[PDB]
């Protein structure tokens, strides 16, 4: 998981899956939005945050062998830590889940 | 003998008989119970508390050359330090104890 707090615009950085990550979550109009950085270099910008579908859409981003992040529901900064969670999945688990998605 | 105290749940450790033991005593409904650990590896869970019946039952536990433990009388944590004791017998003493028991 990702320890999160109820703030309209926040950022998180941690070491996950033998690599360094930096997630910046901000409110944009209605939907939540995130910006993902790995090891100091950007990956993707302004990813719309939704339930279930992963934040990284593209193969050359989420893994040759790395992982991914998934929300269980549509995010809401007034609910974080309270019934809404973000989970990080390693390569094998996310490959299994992606195959199950079909 | 082993230093005990009058508390319904405790776990003392000691270095006796060329080995490192950790014992646990706790009241369970009617009788007492015990948990015995050696070298950081669990041995038994929930062995009961009887006077004269040694705590370790089985050969893969009590010794190739180790010792064993026995209560003089059916123990209760109210009398610990007063008439109720726990004694440790090294390999030769325990072997002769078992020989004489039957």
């Amino acid at each position: 998981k990702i320890p999160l707090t109820a703030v309209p615009n926040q950022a998180i950085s941690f070491n996950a899956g033998s690599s360094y990550w930096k997630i910046r979550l901000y409110q944009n109009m209605d939907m939540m939005n995130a910006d993902i950085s790995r090891d100091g270099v950007i990956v993707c910008h302004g990813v719309r945050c939704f339930g279930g579908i992963p934040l990284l859409q593209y193969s050359h981003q989420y893994r040759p062998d790395y992982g991914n992040f998934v929300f269980d529901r549509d995010a809401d900064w007034t609910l974080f830590g309270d019934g809404i969670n973000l989970f990080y999945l390693d390569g094998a688990e996310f490959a299994e889940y992606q195959a199950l998605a079909t | 003998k082993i230093p005990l105290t009058a508390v319904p749940n405790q776990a003392i450790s000691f270095n006796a008989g060329s080995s490192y033991w950790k014992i646990r005593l706790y009241q369970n409904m009617d009788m007492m119970n015990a948990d015995i650990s050696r070298d950081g590896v669990i041995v038994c869970h929930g062995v009961r508390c009887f006077g004269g019946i040694p705590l370790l039952q089985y050969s893969h536990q009590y010794r190739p050359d180790y010792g064993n433990f026995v209560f003089d009388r059916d123990a209760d944590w109210t009398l610990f330090g007063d008439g109720i004791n726990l004694f440790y017998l090294d390999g030769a003493e325990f072997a002769e104890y078992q020989a004489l028991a039957t």
Binding site: G81, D82, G83 | N9, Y26, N28, N33, I42, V43, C44, H45, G46, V47
Partner: protein, 53 residues
């Protein structure tokens, strides 16, 4: 959910009452809402106590 496998190859493991009570409180929090009142006064508190016992 919060079930424990307390029966193992070495025997049976009994937990202290604080741990069981905390597990039951977590289960009820996940059931109802992360800010519920769980005390002796409220009915849900009595249900929690009954479950723990």
């Amino acid at each position: 959910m919060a079930n424990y496998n307390y029966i193992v190859d070495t025997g049976v493991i009994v937990a202290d009452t604080a741990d069981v009570l905390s597990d039951v409180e977590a289960e009820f929090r996940a059931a109802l809402g992360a800010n519920i009142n769980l005390a002796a006064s409220t009915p849900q508190g009595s249900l929690v106590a009954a479950e723990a016992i």
